């Protein structure tokens, strides 16, 4: 009864480590659409056809 | 896990919900000004190559 | 996301999980009457020695 009583806290550290890993999903999912929009800007001013104020 | 106050399955929903409701906005916009950069927030540097050209 | 993700954190900190004690309530019910009649036996012991006499 006891070793059942205590699996309670098994289950409590199981939901914090999800919630800890969907906050760093949600970060994540920001940071990969701001890689993404980095990636055009160097794509862009990698041409050189610019003027200097564009680049 | 039946809970009757929190509702994660809600708020999941509610959240893709305003994401598909910012798309649409999107889209709105783009299509009555008829342009996809309108303005600064759309993407500054090409607004301002936009602007000064 | 984070507000909702912390107050689905204290949901799954505090919130019962009510289908369980549907079943714990009727049991607990069945229990207690069985008490009470095991207590209402109980009380009537010293009565069998009155016809001793």
Known sequence: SATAASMNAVKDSLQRGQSTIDVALAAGDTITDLLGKMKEKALAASDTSLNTASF | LNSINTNAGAMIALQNLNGTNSELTTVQQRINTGKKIASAKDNGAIWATAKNQ | ?53
């Open chain 3, 1 to 53: 996301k984070l507000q909702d993700s912390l107050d689905a954190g204290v949901g799954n900190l505090v919130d019962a999980d009510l289908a369980k004690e549907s079943a714990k309530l009727q049991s607990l019910q069945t229990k207690q009457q069985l008490g009470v009649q095991a207590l209402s036996i109980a009380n009537q012991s010293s009565s069998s020695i009155l016809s001793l006499f």
